[PDB]
Design a protein around this ligand. Structure first.
Ligand SMILES: Nc1ncnc2c1ncn2[C@@H]1O[C@H](COP(=O)(O)OP(=O)(O)OP(=O)(O)O)[C@@H](O)[C@H]1O
Ligand SMILES: Nc1ncnc2c1ncn2[C@@H]1O[C@H](COP(=O)(O)OP(=O)(O)OP(=O)(O)O)[C@@H](O)[C@H]1O
Ligand SMILES: [Mg+2]
Ligand SMILES: [Mg+2]
Lengths: 53, 500, 465, 75
């Protein structure tokens, strides 16, 4: 039970800091060229929904 | 390991933002959201808010829709976007929910992962009619000696557990759940029973202890725990009995048998009273809305015994009512008594004296009766009921003749015989043998303080070198006078062997 | 014409019609709905929109759904072809025996008979029940109400009256299950099958059954009593027969009327009731009557919420009945069955010029003895029996013997208990109570008076002890 | 397939973190101070609860049979 609790605690801590680092890196992952590409893709999706009337 | 789970959660989280006829929250407060928009929405239709909450479209007014929120109202602000789901309020059902603790909406709260449900059923479903119903004839074995003898429960029956706080209502219900392990582990699929426990308004620690107790006794494998605790919103506490009833109605309509317990319906009625008072509805008796009888009646009418042309299924309900100072003359207890087929009243006075379970025999009756019992149990319980009636007739005035003292001693020995410990239910053969020994005068020389020790040692003796007696009882299904004489002889031999 | 659903709230559906409005109480059939959803118009809201109560569930109703006016109220089949058949609120057969092939239909809403169409004949109906036939006797043609709470016994008394009266009746019978257990309706149907009152193989059935139970929506429970009334009114007027009408129970009708009252935009009455409870109950109950064309003997069960008699629904129902049989929980706690309150049951046939001078004098003497015992019970509960005088002890002993002898084993209740049910002739009842009142049986124990039919069984049980 | 850019970016960041964790040998990568403090507090609490301070729990413990003294058969 001690080994199970130790491994589960380490797994939970690893998951928590991985999630926080992923959030921070995603907030650091935005580039203006990719922002323009995502805006163009959103406009294309909105136009595709406009076709589906 | 973890990265694969992250990839599966990311791939399964597809937004799919298309069409999506929506509305705007005009105002949020008192658990009711007014939504401007949603022209083509249906009545009682489930919606989703922008914060991830869900709701039910209650009122279809012209200029707005009144939506009952299944959650806290601090997560919803003015001007939020409400999306319709296109479905009347439904919960997942199936055998995937066995072994799981879910909330009122069916979302798992035990951390075991997603439920792989294949079907969903609505919570507002009408009850079966006269033709798809047949008489209740199969026994529901709770494992309690007093219930299985005096107030029998059949499959499809609605039996009320009513009493004051801290009197053992939840203990009786959990023992009924635990007792079905012998049927579920056996091979007879007709006698297997699937349990649903609906915790409404209780503390979260209490529900955690109940789940641990069911896990230790391995009764969790056939049990679904629907939890709506005291910290949850009132609409969740109102919805949870109907969600559990839909989960039991799955087994009812598929030829299986389900037992459902609502612990307790008085807290659900308090939550519904809060919802109605926040909706400015007119209060009635004890400031309750006038459809609280309809609330419990539409919940409990779905527990019934189906016919053979409908699969032969059944749903058994055990509602729980908490009274104040033992008053069964209140509004909600009188409603549930008029709805159900019988009650099991628990006394505070008997509970303070150590009589556990504290079942009041004079007040707890069952309208089904002989159709809900086996032959041997009915044969010995009729004599037990007559002897306890004679004891209650002679002990009311005697507060003497040799016959009166004999009846008093017999009633005292039967009362000490019906006492049972918590979390240890008994098989029907052990209860039949125990009541047979008590009724037939085999305990006349035994002190009332040693009845429990005699009961344990006699059970050990029967299971040790009297297996042929149990085989004969199971084969005959009753107690013949020849086997009665053999049982009297071996009881006399056992009591002479124990002390001489 | 054709209308469209504009609102659905509970069992209340608002529908808007384009050209012409259906009248009040007109039946509307919802189009696109499978199991015949029928809406009854309750009020004209205005702007070519009317408000209706649904006779079934309102789930799956979308706004703008088409609804068709039938041009008439809810019409239900009436005639000899409805005997032995089970019908719902809208008159459809629900016994799975095929359609009811008849030529005669009638609307479930009809005006009451006028003041000139009244009969004043008061002839005693003998039921075989000692407490009924002595203290509150029933009349041949007239209204009987069994008031009782939860679990005090009204279905058992209903079934006992059906066993003792309806089988040896000759005329006809109608049962109307209103908001009760569907298990009870199944058991009564199979009971009438076994007893031969319903013939599944041929004609000469004598009882017609209409059932709308507590699983039904409040719109259905508020109109099924009118459906059973319509069957009984056809059997009374258009055939000139003697009809037995059993309703179980009236309070479900007047409660289902109150469940939809808040959804109709009405101000609630006292203790949250409908403000038109008295008038709706009046228009319903005045149709149940004995006319010059035919006779109807009606037995109706009434439920008292939370064991209260000052509740507005039973207090309204009290003035609409001839014979009342009030059942008390406290008497049922004492083991006396049927738990009829002797000092709360009236009949209006209890008159010395109607039921006999001896019968009236015995009944009033029993009521005076029980009232004196009730007055003494306050001193008994504190100071005990020692402080009482000798006449008070005689009053208590005779009153306890009277209370035991009022109990009677019923034939329908044998499965509950095991005692053989006893049918007591009224002459044996008045002879036994005259023997008890005269002090001829003071030497017998009171347990010998318990659960026995005639006074001969009292003597036999006393000699057995 | 119409793969969303956010989902693909999230998958790329997860694969990047997995490669860096393999480069770091599976150790915690750029964890905050409060998470490290809570991990140390929970490890100390479990060590005190499971008695890891008395002996190392990752190895096989040793046992001693407490030498029994029976009741006096003689008087
Ligand atoms: N048969 C029994 N034998 C021994 N103890 C019992 C028995 N039945 C109940 N108890 C004990 O009585 C106490 C109260 O029982 P329980 O919690 O089941 O009652 P309850 O009515 O659900 O109370 P609450 O109002 O708090 O929900 C518990 O400590 C339980 O262990
Ligand atoms: N005459 C009787 N003899 C024996 N027991 C009786 C008798 N009348 C009533 N009882 C007891 O009372 C119980 C209640 O009977 P019943 O269901 O007819 O009551 P009720 O007033 O119709 O109740 P509800 O209003 O809930 O339908 C019976 O099941 C039986 O235990
Ligand atoms: Mg409890
Ligand atoms: Mg009844």
């Amino acid at each position: 039970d001690y080994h199970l609790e130790t491994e589960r605690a380490q797994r939970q801590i690893k998951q928590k800091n991985m999630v926080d680092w992923i959030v921070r890196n995603v907030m650091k992952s935005i580039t203006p060229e990719q922002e323009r590409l995502m805006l163009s893709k959103c406009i294309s999706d909105l136009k595709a929904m406009s076709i589906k009337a | 390991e973890i990265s694969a789970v992250l990839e599966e959660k990311i791939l399964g989280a597809a937004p799919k933002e298309n069409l999506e006829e929506t509305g705007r929250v005009l105002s949020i407060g008192d658990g009711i959201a007014r939504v401007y928009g949603l022209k083509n929405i249906q009545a009682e239709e489930m919606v989703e808010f922008s914060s991830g909450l869900k709701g039910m479209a209650l009122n279809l007014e012209p200029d707005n829709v009144g939506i009952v929120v299944f959650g806290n109202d601090k997560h919803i602000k003015e001007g939020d976007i409400v999306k319709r789901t296109g479905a009347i309020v439904d919960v997942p059902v199936g055998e995937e929910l066995l072994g799981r603790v879910v909330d009122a909406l069916g979302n798992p709260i035990d951390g075991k992962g997603p439920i792989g449900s294949k079907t969903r059923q609505r919570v507002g479903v009408k009850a079966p009619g006269i033709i798809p119903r047949v008489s209740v004839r199969e026994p529901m074995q709770t494992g309690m000696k007093a219930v299985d003898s005096l107030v029998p429960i059949g499959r499809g029956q609605r039996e009320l557990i009513i009493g004051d706080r801290q009197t053992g209502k939840t203990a009786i219900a959990i023992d009924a759940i635990i007792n079905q392990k012998r049927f579920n582990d056996a091979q007879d699929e007709k006698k297997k029973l699937y349990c649903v426990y609906v915790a409404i308004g209780q503390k979260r620690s209490t529900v955690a202890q109940i789940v641990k107790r069911l896990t230790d006794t391995d009764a969790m494998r056939y049990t679904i725990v629907v939890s709506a605790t005291a910290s949850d919103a009132a609409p969740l506490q109102y919805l949870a009995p109907y969600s559990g009833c839909a989960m039991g109605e799955f087994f009812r309509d598929n030829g299986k048998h389900a037992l459902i317990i609502y612990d307790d319906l008085s807290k659900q009625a308090v939550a519904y009273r809060q919802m109605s008072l926040l909706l400015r509805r007119p209060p009635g008796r004890e400031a309750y809305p006038g459809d609280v009888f309809y609330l419990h009646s539409r919940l409990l009418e779905r527990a019934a015994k189906m016919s053979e042309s409908n699969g032969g299924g059944s749903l058994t309900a055990l509602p729980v009512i908490e009274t104040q100072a033992g008053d069964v003359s209140a509004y909600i207890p009188t409603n549930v008594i008029s709805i159900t087929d019988g009650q099991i009243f628990l006394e505070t006075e008997l509970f303070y004296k150590g009589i556990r379970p504290a079942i009041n025999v004079g007040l707890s009756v069952s309208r089904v009766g002989s159709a809900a019992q086996t032959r041997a149990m009915k044969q010995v319980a009729g004599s037990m009921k007559l002897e306890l009636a004679q004891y209650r007739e002679v002990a009311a005035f005697a507060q003497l003749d040799a016959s009166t003292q004999q009846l008093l001693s017999r009633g005292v020995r039967l009362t000490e015989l019906l006492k049972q410990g918590q979390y240890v239910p008994m098989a029907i053969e052990d209860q039949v043998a125990i009541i047979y020994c008590g009724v037939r005068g085999h305990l006349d020389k035994v002190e009332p303080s040693k009845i429990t020790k005699f009961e344990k040692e006699f059970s050990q003796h029967i299971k040790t070198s009297h297996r042929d007696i149990l085989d004969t009882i199971a084969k005959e299904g009753q107690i013949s006078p020849d086997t009665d004489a053999k049982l009297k002889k071996v009881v006399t031999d056992f009591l002479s062997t124990f002390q001489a | 014409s054709n209308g469209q659903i504009t609102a659905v709230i509970g069992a209340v559906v608002d529908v808007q019609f384009e050209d012409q409005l259906p009248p009040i109480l007109n039946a509307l059939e919802v189009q696109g709905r499978s199991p015949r959803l029928i809406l009854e118009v309750a009020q004209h809201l205005g702007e070519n929109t009317v408000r209706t109560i649904a006779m079934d569930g309102t789930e799956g109703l979308v706004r703008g759904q088409n609804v068709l006016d039938t041009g008439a109220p809810i019409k239900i089949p009436v005639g000899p072809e409805t005997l032995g058949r089970i019908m719902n609120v809208i008159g459809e057969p629900i016994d799975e025996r095929g359609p009811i092939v008849t030529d005669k239909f009638a609307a479930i809403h009809a005006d009451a008979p006028e003041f000139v169409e009244m009969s004043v004949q008061q002839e005693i109906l003998v039921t075989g029940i000692k407490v009924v036939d002595l203290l509150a006797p029933y009349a041949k043609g007239g209204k009987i109400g069994l008031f009782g709470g939860a679990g005090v016994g009204k279905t058992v008394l209903i079934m006992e009256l059906i066993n003792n009266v309806a089988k040896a009746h000759g005329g006809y019978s109608v049962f109307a299950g209103v908001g009760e257990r569907t298990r009870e309706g199944n058991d009564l149907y199979h009971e009438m099958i076994e007893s031969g009152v319903i013939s599944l193989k041929d004609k000469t059935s004598k009882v017609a059954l209409v059932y709308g139970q507590m699983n039904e929506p409040p719109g259905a429970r508020a109109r099924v009593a009118l459906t059973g009334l319509t069957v009984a009114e056809y059997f009374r007027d258009q055939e000139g027969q003697d009809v037995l009408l059993f309703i179980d129970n009236i309070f479900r009708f007047t409660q289902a009327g109150s469940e939809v009252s808040a959804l109709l935009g009405r101000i609630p009455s006292a203790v949250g009731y409908q403000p038109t409870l008295a008038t709706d109950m009046g228009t319903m109950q005045e149709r149940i009557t004995t006319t010059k064309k035919g006779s109807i003997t009606s037995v109706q069960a009434i439920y008292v919420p939370a064991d209260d008699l000052t509740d507005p629904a039973p207090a309204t129902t009290f003035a609409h009945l001839d014979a009342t049989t009030v059942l008390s929980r406290a008497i049922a706690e004492l083991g006396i069955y049927p738990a009829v309150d002797p000092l709360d049951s009236t009949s209006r046939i209890l008159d010395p010029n109607i039921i006999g001078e001896e019968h009236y004098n015995i009944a009033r003497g029993v009521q005076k003895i029980l009232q004196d015992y009730k007055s003494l019970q306050d001193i008994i509960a504190i100071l005990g029996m020692d402080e009482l005088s000798e006449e008070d002890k005689l009053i208590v002993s005779r009153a306890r013997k009277i209370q035991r002898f009022l109990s009677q084993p019923f034939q329908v209740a044998e499965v509950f208990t095991g005692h053989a049910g006893k049918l007591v002739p009224i002459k044996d009842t008045i002879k036994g109570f005259k023997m008890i009142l005269n002090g001829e049986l003071d030497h017998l124990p009171e347990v010998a008076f318990y659960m026995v039919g005639p006074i001969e069984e009292v003597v036999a049980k006393a000699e057995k002890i | 397939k119409a793969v969303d850019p956010i989902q693909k970016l999230f998958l790329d960041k997860i694969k990047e973190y997995d490669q860096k964790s393999k480069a770091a040998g599976g150790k915690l990568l750029e964890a905050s101070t409060e998470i490290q403090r809570e991990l140390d507090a929970e490890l100390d609490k479990l060590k005190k609860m499971y008695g890891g301070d008395t002996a190392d729990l990752s190895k096989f413990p040793s046992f001693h049979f407490e030498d029994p003294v029976v009741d006096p058969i003689n008087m």
